Structure formats: structure tokens, C-alpha cells
Write a protein that binds this ligand. Sequence first.
Ligand code: HEM
Length: 148
Amino acid sequence: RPESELIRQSWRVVSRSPLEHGTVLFARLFALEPSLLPLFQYNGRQFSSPEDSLSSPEFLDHIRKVMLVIDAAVTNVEDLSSLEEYLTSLGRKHRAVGVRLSSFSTVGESLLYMLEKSLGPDFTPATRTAWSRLYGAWVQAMSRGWDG
Ligand code: HEM
């Protein structure tokens, strides 16, 4: 696919600094949906503000985890059938920690936002569309986690 090379190419720049870029993703995500903040409970504590999350080693570790799962999507983009079982469970894990499936659309918008801001001019409509199909496929995988 050429869809698959646009993903690879765009991913390369952000994948070099996953925490920086993942930090953009989650700052955006919290700006769009503040109610996600309380879902990250480390040490039984709740973050009061979005910026509290950025001081938390566990939250930042979660940013690294997120970027690794996305990087696995990019590597396996040509088929992606392959990650179906892993993603189904990851989806269930999130159902368990309290995430609504619908929240993953906001996640998608944050990812696209982060890519757009990092790529600027380079983020062509072909690229936006490729990433939307990829993520749409990804979230379909995950949605199995919700017993659906
Ligand atoms: C609505 C957005 C999200 C919320 C509220 C959320 C929250 C959480 C929480 C509370 C945990 C358990 C604590 C931890 O492991 O740090 C977790 C685990 C994890 N998350 Fe997320 N998460 C979100 C999105 C994502 C996304 C988009 C990805 C990847 C694309 C991801 C990847 C992971 C991974 C790999 C784990 C470890 C699960 C395990 O191995 O047990 N998360 N998430």
C-alpha cells in the first residue's frame, strides 16, 4: 500500500521523541475531555488538574506505553489482523479501568491533532485520511474489549 508508507513516513519524526509528542496528545485529550483525568488513579490519588498529570512518573510511563502500542500499529499496519487479540484485551483492560469506548474517538482526534501540529505542511489530506483509516481499524480491534 501507499496508504501504509504515508503512515510510516509521518510516524518517523514523532517516534523519535515519543514522550514529547505523546505529551501533546494527552494535553490535547484532556483539553477536549476533562472527565478522562480522574481515570488515571496512581497511589489511590486523583489528579486535580491536567497539568498535575504531567508531573507523575506513572502517567508519563503510560504516555510511553501508548506510543509503543501506536508504534506497533504502524509496524503491523499492512494487515493489523495480527494485533486483534492483544487489542481486544487492551480494550478490556480499559473497560475495566473505566474508559468508555466513545472516549477513544477523542483519543483519535488528539492523535490526529498531534500529528497535524508536528507535521505542519507535511500533514497532507492523504496523510490525515490514511491515519484516520488506520486508527479507525485500531479502535475497531479495541472495541471487542467492550464485549462487542
Ligand atoms: C481515554 C484514553 C486513555 C485512558 C483514560 C487510559 C488509562 C489507562 C490506565 C488507568 C491504565 C492502567 C495504569 C497504567 O498501566 O499506567 C492504562 C494502561 C495501559 N494503556 Fe491506557 N489509557 C488511555 C488510552 C490509551 C491508548 C490510546 C493506548 C495505546 C494506543 C494505551 C495504552 C496502554 C497500555 C499499553 C497499558 C498497559 C496495560 C497492561 O499491560 O496491563 N492507553 N491506561
